[PDB]
Enzyme design. Structure first.
Site, PDB file in Angstrom:
ATOM      1  N   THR A  16       0.832  -1.196   0.000  1.00  0.00           N
ATOM      2  CA  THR A  16       0.000   0.000   0.000  1.00  0.00           C
ATOM      3  C   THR A  16       0.870   1.251   0.000  1.00  0.00           C
ATOM      4  O   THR A  16       0.360   2.341  -0.126  1.00  0.00           O
ATOM      5  CB  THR A  16      -0.913   0.108   1.247  1.00  0.00           C
ATOM      6  OG1 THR A  16      -0.182  -0.268   2.443  1.00  0.00           O
ATOM      7  CG2 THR A  16      -2.155  -0.757   1.104  1.00  0.00           C
ATOM      8  N   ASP A  39       8.305 -10.552 -28.142  1.00  0.00           N
ATOM      9  CA  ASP A  39       9.472  -9.699 -27.965  1.00  0.00           C
ATOM     10  C   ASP A  39      10.641 -10.317 -28.703  1.00  0.00           C
ATOM     11  O   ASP A  39      10.466 -10.805 -29.817  1.00  0.00           O
ATOM     12  CB  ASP A  39       9.761  -9.605 -26.470  1.00  0.00           C
ATOM     13  CG  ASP A  39      10.713  -8.467 -26.107  1.00  0.00           C
ATOM     14  OD1 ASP A  39      11.689  -8.166 -26.846  1.00  0.00           O
ATOM     15  OD2 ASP A  39      10.511  -7.887 -25.021  1.00  0.00           O
ATOM     16  N   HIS A  69      16.415  -8.522 -23.986  1.00  0.00           N
ATOM     17  CA  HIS A  69      15.188  -7.839 -23.636  1.00  0.00           C
ATOM     18  C   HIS A  69      13.992  -8.787 -23.332  1.00  0.00           C
ATOM     19  O   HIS A  69      13.334  -8.653 -22.303  1.00  0.00           O
ATOM     20  CB  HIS A  69      14.846  -6.798 -24.721  1.00  0.00           C
ATOM     21  CG  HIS A  69      13.642  -5.975 -24.398  1.00  0.00           C
ATOM     22  ND1 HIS A  69      13.728  -4.704 -23.871  1.00  0.00           N
ATOM     23  CD2 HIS A  69      12.319  -6.252 -24.504  1.00  0.00           C
ATOM     24  CE1 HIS A  69      12.505  -4.230 -23.687  1.00  0.00           C
ATOM     25  NE2 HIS A  69      11.635  -5.155 -24.054  1.00  0.00           N
ATOM     26  N   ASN A 161       8.112   4.895 -24.459  1.00  0.00           N
ATOM     27  CA  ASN A 161       9.103   5.631 -23.648  1.00  0.00           C
ATOM     28  C   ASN A 161       9.503   6.986 -24.236  1.00  0.00           C
ATOM     29  O   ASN A 161      10.644   7.361 -24.197  1.00  0.00           O
ATOM     30  CB  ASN A 161      10.377   4.770 -23.502  1.00  0.00           C
ATOM     31  CG  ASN A 161      10.094   3.415 -22.872  1.00  0.00           C
ATOM     32  OD1 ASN A 161       9.223   3.275 -22.009  1.00  0.00           O
ATOM     33  ND2 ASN A 161      10.809   2.410 -23.326  1.00  0.00           N
ATOM     34  N   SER A 224       8.378  -1.120 -20.915  1.00  0.00           N
ATOM     35  CA  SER A 224       8.513  -2.508 -21.274  1.00  0.00           C
ATOM     36  C   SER A 224       8.817  -3.383 -20.057  1.00  0.00           C
ATOM     37  O   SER A 224       8.589  -4.564 -20.088  1.00  0.00           O
ATOM     38  CB  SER A 224       9.571  -2.588 -22.362  1.00  0.00           C
ATOM     39  OG  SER A 224       9.637  -3.878 -22.926  1.00  0.00           O
ATOM     40  N   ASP A 260      -1.662   7.875  -5.734  1.00  0.00           N
ATOM     41  CA  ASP A 260      -0.354   7.822  -5.039  1.00  0.00           C
ATOM     42  C   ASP A 260       0.896   8.293  -5.828  1.00  0.00           C
ATOM     43  O   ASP A 260       1.980   8.489  -5.244  1.00  0.00           O
ATOM     44  CB  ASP A 260      -0.133   6.443  -4.425  1.00  0.00           C
ATOM     45  CG  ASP A 260      -1.118   6.150  -3.291  1.00  0.00           C
ATOM     46  OD1 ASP A 260      -1.669   7.121  -2.693  1.00  0.00           O
ATOM     47  OD2 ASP A 260      -1.349   4.943  -2.994  1.00  0.00           O
TER      48      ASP A 260
END
Ligand SMILES: [Ca+2]
Length: 279
Positions: A16, A39, A69, A161, A224, A260
């Site tokens: 949390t 991928d 990756h 990204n 990713s 948050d």
């Protein structure tokens, strides 16, 4: 179950609040589910996958991961040490070459493969696909992601990204799949993370330790890396009977840590994936 000194992302997904380092999860651990990683492929022989990883498709001269990756993503979904769903089955689909590149046509063929291939696999608890790839908007690519989802596979895809609006990216901009932004360990949006009304959720994407090729490990960053957290969380929740492929993304957003994150632009969701595990 409790995994002490977990990678921060795992601890976060079961917390949390930030700043803790133990990962808590039901011991079912995603047993009886399947996750496809689409991928650069997966080094199945990595000790961390313990026999639960397999390559099922490649569009290139080899199915091995020559990049790392896809192995990293796979280890975040389901490796024993670095994975969210420590007992799930992992299927590798190599649509990207060892430079991490793939033509749109190959990527599409890859998505349709999984949508048929899941009928050849044993996955009583449900099926997930992690798509940590991205390119400019294409309705063909979006459409392929929508079919994968409508066939009954929980589809999670990297927001991208570019620190830009993900509406301009595919399959990130496809409404019916789960689009995943990256956060860091102090609960800030990753500085490279895309954003936008098209995002559904945030996962851990900065400094993410996981498996790599040559039987090692490394820390790397990206939407990713965040994507396989959500992909692994869906598989886990599906084996718990809590949700299905069709409603998993919705369920994950309903049960997220809300409000948050910092640096979330006006109009993007402030939701952080969370397993709600009462230990
Ligand atoms: Ca979406």
């Amino acid at each position: 179950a409790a995994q002490t000194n977990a990678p921060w992302g795992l601890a976060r997904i079961s917390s949390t609040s930030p700043g803790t380092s133990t990962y808590y999860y039901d011991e079912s651990a995603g047993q009886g589910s399947c996750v496809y990683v689409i991928d650069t492929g997966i080094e199945a022989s990595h000790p961390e996958f313990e026999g639960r990883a397999q390559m099922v498709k490649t569009y290139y001269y080899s199915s091995r991961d020559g990049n790392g990756h896809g192995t990293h993503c796979a280890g975040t979904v389901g490796s024993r040490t670095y994975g969210v769903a420590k007992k799930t089955q992992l299927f590798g689909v190599k649509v990207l070459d060892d430079n991490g590149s793939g033509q749109y046509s190959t990527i599409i063929a890859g998505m349709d493969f999984v949508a048929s291939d899941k009928n050849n696999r044993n996955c009583p608890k449900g099926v997930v696909a992690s798509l940590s790839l991205g390119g400019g908007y294409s309705s063909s690519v979006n459409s392929a992601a929508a079919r994968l989802q409508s066939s009954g596979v929980m589809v999670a895809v990297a927001a991208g990204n570019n620190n830009a609006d993900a509406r301009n990216y595919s399959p990130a901009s496809e409404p019916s799949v789960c689009t995943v932004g990256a956060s860091d360990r102090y609960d800030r949006r990753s500085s490279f993370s895309n954003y936008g009304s098209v995002l559904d959720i945030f996962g851990p994407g900065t400094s993410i330790l996981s498996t790599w090729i040559g039987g090692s490990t490394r820390s790397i960053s990206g939407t990713s890396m965040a994507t396989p957290h959500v992909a692994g969380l869906a598989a886990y929740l599906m084996t718990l009977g809590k949700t299905t492929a069709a409603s998993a993304c919705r369920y994950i957003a309903d049960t997220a840590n809300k409000g948050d994150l910092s640096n979330i632009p006006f109009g993007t969701v402030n939701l952080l994936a969370y397993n709600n595990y009462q230990a």
